[PDB]
């Protein structure tokens, strides 16, 4: 039989790069039983035009799976949503391989959606781990008000309540808001001396500037942030010594395609060795009934382990996301990011360099300076 899968990509060169990968995938373990195809489209400015073009792709092929990317990001959020609503109507399993928004994990809204990269919510796992290793026990949290930030608040709390630590003074602020010094002053008389930031590239620049007038960047105090906090217009204003972090091979946009076709190909062979495969419907128009075996496809696709992954081991969790991902810690010295360690799945192993704390010292500055003057 002929199994047809499609994808949506950015550049025509990448689309041809995609087709080359499926050819090598076919020659890897293929046979005379089932053969494969590929089909590709390109982005458009108006999302409504994309949605119509999405099932212009669908009428032309018995699509079994879709792929989506957003290498050009005038809107990093609204680019991969039109494909999800259109394909999710027929339970077509759509895979996304470069998108880090946390909204796409709520499966009640998006019925079928998978990933090959963990989102921003899973970032706080490394934050808590560094706390245990470095023995920091009094933290100040600082988060935005959008759903992108509120997810981090819940993630840290359940990870800390398992040991009954109860982090103190979680502060919120409206996104896109200037003059946050009315909020920082409330965090000026607090005992804890370590701040954890999680916001957007536009808000992070403001708080970095706002901290310059409060001596919040001075010695004794230690900052630690997320991936998006130090990649953008805010890096120029960032204070030195911020122990940020990054992804190992994110934004590659090329190794993911090789990984995505490998896991998909293993799934279609594993599934087709069964009964009652019925094929998807032909046509955006003229049909109203969902693919009768769509949920079955997503069910088997969840636990499909993959060994020879260019990015590494590929596996999925209960909600659907790449688990056991890699994280590479940074540190800002003389306006240049330098690696100071590696996070590998569960633990952290730093070596080969000495961490430069923001004040310029060379000894680990502990927090919790007991305020002698009481109220």
């Amino acid at each position: 039989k002929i199994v047809n899968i499609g994808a949506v990509l950015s550049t025509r060169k990448h689309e041809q790069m995609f087709r080359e990968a499926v050819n090598q995938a076919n020659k890897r373990h293929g046979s005379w039983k089932i053969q494969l195809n590929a089909t590709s489209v390109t982005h458009k400015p108006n999302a409504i035009q994309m949605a119509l073009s999405v099932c212009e792709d669908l009428i032309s092929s018995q699509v079994y799976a879709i792929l989506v990317s957003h290498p050009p990001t005038p809107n990093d959020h609204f680019t991969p949503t039109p494909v999800s609503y259109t394909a999710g109507f027929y339970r077509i399993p759509v895979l996304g391989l470069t998108t880090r928004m946390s909204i796409y994990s709520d499966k009640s809204i998006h019925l079928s959606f998978l990933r090959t990269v963990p989102p921003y919510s899973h970032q706080s796992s490394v934050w808590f781990e560094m706390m245990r290793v470095y023995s920091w026990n009094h933290i100040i949290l600082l988060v935005s008000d959008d759903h992108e930030g509120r997810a981090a608040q819940k993630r840290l709390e359940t990870l800390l309540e398992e040991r009954e630590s109860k982090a103190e003074k979680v502060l919120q602020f409206d996104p896109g808001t200037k003059n946050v010094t009315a909020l920082l002053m409330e965090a000026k008389e607090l005992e804890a001396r370590v701040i954890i930031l999680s916001a957007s590239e536009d808000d992070a620049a403001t708080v970095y500037r706002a901290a310059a007038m409060l001596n919040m960047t001075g010695s004794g105090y230690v900052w630690l942030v997320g991936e998006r906090e130090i990649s953008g217009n805010a890096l120029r204003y960032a204070p030195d010594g911020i122990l940020g972090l990054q992804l190992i091979n994110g934004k590659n946009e090329s190794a993911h395609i090789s990984d995505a076709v490998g896991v998909v190909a293993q799934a279609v062979h594993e599934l087709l060795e069964k009964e009652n495969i019925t094929d998807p419907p032909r046509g955006c128009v003229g049909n109203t009934n969902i693919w009768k075996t769509g949920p079955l496809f997503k069910r088997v696709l969840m636990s499909s382990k993959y060994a020879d992954g260019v990015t590494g081991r590929v596996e999925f969790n209960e909600d659907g996301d790449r688990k056991f991902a890699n994280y590479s810690i940074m540190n800002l010295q003389n306006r240049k990011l330098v690696q100071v360690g590696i996070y590998n799945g569960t633990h952290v192993i730093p070596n080969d360099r000495k961490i430069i704390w923001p004040g310029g010292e060379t000894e680990k500055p502990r927090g919790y300076q007991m305020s002698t003057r009481l109220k």
Binding site: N46, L52, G88, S108, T288
Partner: protein
């Protein structure tokens, strides 16, 4: 201007033609001349193509939706459309009645229903009134069950009862699955009342297993939320007698009456704007051609549309787009396989009609108890 969309029909087209001419049907003080658009075979292509095709002309100032139940994916599409074209929309139907909790940051979906938590609030009033105070929770692996499972534990803490819950069970109830494993978990159960949460397709499978395991007779009674029931009127087989579910006030009404309520909200909100700020907020909506960079004026009309009272009812909405404090009712399945209104819930206090639960039997024939007797006193 107000638009009306028909998205599902066993052809009422006499009623559709009845809504063509009446530009003076309503008594609301506004230009309520409606334009109607019909839809056959609702789907992402036809729904998207026709919606701004009609919006491309006549400068309509809002849309009103209606469709059939058992379709759920059409809920997000309407939200997606309103995020771009920046036009307020209102859904009064069964299909898009179920509430989506996360909505797009700049959308104006304005759903018409009740949240999952609010339904649980009314049920626990019923449960405590008869003082059953002991239940077991059964949920399938349906999207959104984790949200529901937090509802019971949170509500059971903000109350003054022991609320001795025995156990919680989870089991896959699709077309394919191991019935023996579910049989093992079902037979190993003992509880007076059950609170189950499942979709309609799971419900038929679940209650089929219930009778085989002997969990249907007068020794038990079931509670399910608004989702699990049928369309509204024709319950299938295997639904046990004595079912309980909470449904909003418009449970029993005519489709033509619902539309008049829908147009009333848009008309009353529009006229209320003219009195306060003035002169008919700018009605404008466009499809793909340069849509929605930012909304500095229509967003101000959004707030005016939230609070509205009409014909002695309160329709105040929440930023989440679902009704706040509606006059919910409770229905039950009697011994004629129909639905009978049992008790209202108005202004925070729960009324009733049966002082005691009549508990049926295998073949009607009401069951009545020696140890229970009616006492008459005075002050």
């Amino acid at each position: 201007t107000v638009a009306v969309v028909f998205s599902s029909s066993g052809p009422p087209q006499a009623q559709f033609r009845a809504r063509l001419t009446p530009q003076s049907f309503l008594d609301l003080p506004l230009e309520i001349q409606p334009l109607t658009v019909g839809v056959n075979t609702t789907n992402p292509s036809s729904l998207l193509t026709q919606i701004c095709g009609l919006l491309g002309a006549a400068h309509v100032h809002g849309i009103v939706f209606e469709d059939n139940v058992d379709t759920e994916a059409v809920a997000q599409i309407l939200d997606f459309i309103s995020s771009q074209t920046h036009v307020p929309i209102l859904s009064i139907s069964g299909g898009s009645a179920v509430v989506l909790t996360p909505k797009e940051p700049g959308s104006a979906f304005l759903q018409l229903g009740v949240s999952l938590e609010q339904q649980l609030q009314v049920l626990f009033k019923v449960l405590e009134e008869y003082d059953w105070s002991a239940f077991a929770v059964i949920t399938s692996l349906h999207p959104g069950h984790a949200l529901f499972l937090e509802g019971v534990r949170a509500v059971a803490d903000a109350s003054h009862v022991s609320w001795r819950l025995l156990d919680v069970v989870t089991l896959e109830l699709g077309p394919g699955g191991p019935r023996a494993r579910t049989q093992r978990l079902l037979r190993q159960l003992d509880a007076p009342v059950f609170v189950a949460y499942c979709s309609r397709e799971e419900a038929e499978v679940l209650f089929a297993e219930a009778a085989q395991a002997g969990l249907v007779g007068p020794g038990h009674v079931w509670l399910v939320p608004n989702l699990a029931l049928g369309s509204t009127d024709a319950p299938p087989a295997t639904f046990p007698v004595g079912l309980i579910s909470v449904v909003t006030e418009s449970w029993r009404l005519s489709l033509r009456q619902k539309v008049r309520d829908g147009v009333a909200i848009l008309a009353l909100g529009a006229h209320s704007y003219w009195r306060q700020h003035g002169t008919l907020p700018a009605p404008a909506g466009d499809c793909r051609v340069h849509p929605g960079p930012v909304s500095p004026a229509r967003e101000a009309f959004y707030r005016h549309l939230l609070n509205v009272t009409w014909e002695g009812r309160d329709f105040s909405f929440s930023p989440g787009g679902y009704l706040v404090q509606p006059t919910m009712v409770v229905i039950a399945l009697n011994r004629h396989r129909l639905w009978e209104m049992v008790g209202r819930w108005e202004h925070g206090v729960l009324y009733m009609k049966y002082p005691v639960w009549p508990r049926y039997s295998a073949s009607l024939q009401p069951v009545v108890d020696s140890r229970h007797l009616t006492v008459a006193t005075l002050e």
